[PDB]
Design an enzyme around this catalytic site. Structure first.
Site, PDB file in Angstrom:
ATOM      1  N   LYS B 113       0.945  -1.161   0.032  1.00  0.00           N
ATOM      2  CA  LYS B 113      -0.060  -0.018  -0.213  1.00  0.00           C
ATOM      3  C   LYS B 113       0.866   1.220   0.059  1.00  0.00           C
ATOM      4  O   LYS B 113       1.839   1.013   0.822  1.00  0.00           O
ATOM      5  CB  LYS B 113      -0.726  -0.077   1.345  1.00  0.00           C
ATOM      6  CG  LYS B 113      -1.894   1.045   1.250  1.00  0.00           C
ATOM      7  CD  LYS B 113      -3.010   0.915   0.788  1.00  0.00           C
ATOM      8  CE  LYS B 113      -4.173   2.045   1.030  1.00  0.00           C
ATOM      9  NZ  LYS B 113      -5.218   1.984   0.334  1.00  0.00           N
ATOM     10  N   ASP B 241     -10.088   5.066  14.182  1.00  0.00           N
ATOM     11  CA  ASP B 241     -10.456   4.956  12.828  1.00  0.00           C
ATOM     12  C   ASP B 241     -10.265   3.397  12.048  1.00  0.00           C
ATOM     13  O   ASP B 241     -10.335   3.511  10.817  1.00  0.00           O
ATOM     14  CB  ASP B 241     -10.207   6.134  11.801  1.00  0.00           C
ATOM     15  CG  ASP B 241     -11.027   7.421  12.483  1.00  0.00           C
ATOM     16  OD1 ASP B 241     -11.670   7.384  13.478  1.00  0.00           O
ATOM     17  OD2 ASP B 241     -10.524   8.483  11.935  1.00  0.00           O
TER      18      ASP B 241
END
Ligand SMILES: CC[C@@H](Nc1c(C#N)c(-c2ccc(-c3cccc(Cl)c3F)cc2)nc2cnccc12)C(N)=O
Ligand SMILES: CC[C@@H](Nc1c(C#N)c(-c2ccc(-c3cccc(Cl)c3F)cc2)nc2cnccc12)C(N)=O
Lengths: 322, 312
Positions: B113, B241
């Protein structure tokens, strides 16, 4: 395992750079044939380590390889596998011989020499003719085998390096060595040189010590026929001031130094010790000779004898001693 | 292996991982990591002229962050450096689809990523506590396994990259996938998302479908006990989150239903009395949001644990 440690940081970068160079080529195809671009190519590497491997390597260095594809093809044409070359130059540091300075690989297969930027420029000037000459003689020559060429930078010290094949045996020791040219007044070893363990003797030392070389008529004719072709090639390139390096192995001397402390005495692997010649059946001593040309890269444009004259005198001198 | 790709950044990444691991084979495994190993890096800049001009870009840079720490993490997570090098380089990582983009190693063991320089700074900020947490839990955790972090430069473009372990099986297909947060707020996959082969479904999708995860009492206890410890660590770092990623493998659509728990480390078989033979892959992803981006980390974590406990 392999850390590339040395007190000499330039040797650490050389071992690191040869390791890197060879592993990189393992990820590049072997081409059908070399092209013109391969003779002006390079790879450049700049390493900056921060708080990493700070013990076994310098943190900030550069390593540049000249014409990687060409030197890879030259190794193959001289019968040298890249993994063997890599192990020879990286498993343990090259040893100093102590401007006259050179190193030998730890296994005594290869010679490492610091050269100038002028040298590198002249190397590029001859590289295409040299490569084609190696092709046409199927890698059978007394010329230096140029196997790798590099630029190192560490601690603000820049050097250029050439790797060649050792004229001498990786296993059989040399008790006497000559750097031979011909036709040079006073060309003989200094007093300090003759006081060393293994002096580099020269033309007048060879004559005044009564040095003979006992090879059979066939080996002489084959050797002198190669020398002529190689030296005619050098004269076409306008090169001069090269030497015949002659190393003598004395089997009985080598044997007496073992008793103080499976190839038979005086035998060698001709696929590794490519310059070896056995003595003839009537040598007054059982000896093995190692003979080849070294130190070719002086261009005539850089008493001035011309390369034709140099080549003839050289062949004439070597022919008269054998 | 020529590290060829249509994407020059992928060639550099493959060349870089190859170089990283080979380099570390020339570096002692320390008795233990020291504070300097958490502020360390390797940089290499390559400039090729008329060499390897076909396979690779001629000008590129590769930086590895904290190479000694990520090597130790790889070992603590049961990963051999040569298998890791093999997974990332024998064949190009495959793109997921086309900020949401990611790649999978060719053998589907790892996730790659692109992250921001802000992510790289936050990873350095958490890395000593993360490493010591991994020491303390013996590598048993549902946190993301951070395996390598790098910066690549080629042809004017610079990206930062993190490598993690796939939550999902290297072999068993997932037919259904959820990103779960426990946000009482609205969390529904888009119509576009839902048109795909494998949509990323969310909290309200899980509820509205009446999705069931049937685990036996022992597996659930062990799983919620780990999740609790992991989420309490995240709240202490003031991270929020993050999601639970849930993949469901359908065994009947087919030994069938088996996997190696040393490779597919997040797999849990279904209850024997499950009305469908399933295998679940569940772990935490996407942890690197610090509260200082200004519901607080304690609240996030409690609301998160309550929802996962809620669904099992
Ligand atoms: C007399 C030479 C010395 N040993 C050497 C020796 C050196 N120096 C060399 C050597 C000489 C010169 C160069 C060289 C200089 C400038 C430019 C370029 Cl391109 C070069 F290639 C490279 C290598 N080769 C040897 C081979 N086998 C055994 C002993 C050797 C010694 N003292 O024994
Ligand atoms: C659900 C998201 C996606 N798949 C992912 C996926 C992503 N993205 C990720 C992932 C997410 C975020 C980050 C990340 C961002 C910023 C900074 C840092 Cl340090 C990070 F680590 C890394 C990896 N991990 C997965 C693990 N296993 C299976 C599927 C996965 C997908 N759509 O399927």
């Amino acid at each position: 395992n392999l850390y590339f440690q040395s007190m000499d940081p330039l040797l650490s970068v050389l071992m690191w750079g040869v390791n890197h160079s060879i592993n990189e080529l393992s990820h590049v195809q072997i081409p059908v044939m070399l092209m013109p671009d391969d003779f002006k190519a390079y790879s450049k590497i700049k390493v900056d380590n921060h708080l990493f491997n700070k013990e076994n390597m310098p943190s900030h260095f550069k390593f540049k390889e000249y014409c990687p594809m060409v030197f890879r093809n030259l190794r193959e044409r001289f019968g040298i596998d890249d993994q063997d070359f890599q192990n020879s130059l990286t498993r343990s540091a090259p040893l100093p011989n102590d401007g006259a300075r050179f190193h030998t690989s730890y296994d005594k297969r290869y010679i490492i020499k610091t050269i100038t930027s002028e040298d590198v420029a002249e190397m590029h000037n001859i590289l295409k003719k040299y490569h084609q000459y190696i092709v046409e003689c199927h890698g059978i020559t007394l010329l230096p085998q140029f196997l790798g060429m590099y630029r190192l930078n560490v601690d603000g010290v820049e050097i250029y390096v050439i790797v060649t094949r050792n004229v001498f045996s990786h296993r059989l020791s040399v008790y006497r060595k000559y750097d031979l040219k011909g036709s040079t007044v006073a060309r003989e070893a200094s007093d300090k040189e003759k006081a060393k363990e293994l002096p580099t003797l020269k033309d007048n030392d060879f004559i005044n010590e009564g040095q003979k070389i006992y090879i059979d008529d066939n080996n002489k004719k084959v050797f002198l026929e190669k020398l002529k072709k190689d030296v005619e090639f050098l004269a076409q390139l306008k090169l001069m001031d090269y030497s015949l390096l002659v190393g003598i192995h004395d089997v009985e001397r080598a044997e007496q130094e073992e008793v103080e402390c499976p190839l038979a005495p005086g035998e060698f692997d001709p696929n590794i010790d490519v310059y070896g010649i056995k003595c003839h059946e009537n040598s007054p001593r059982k000896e093995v000779y190692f003979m080849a040309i070294i130190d070719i890269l002086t261009h005539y444009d850089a008493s001035t004898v011309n390369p034709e004259q140099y080549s003839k005198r050289f062949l004439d001198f070597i022919g008269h001693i054998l």
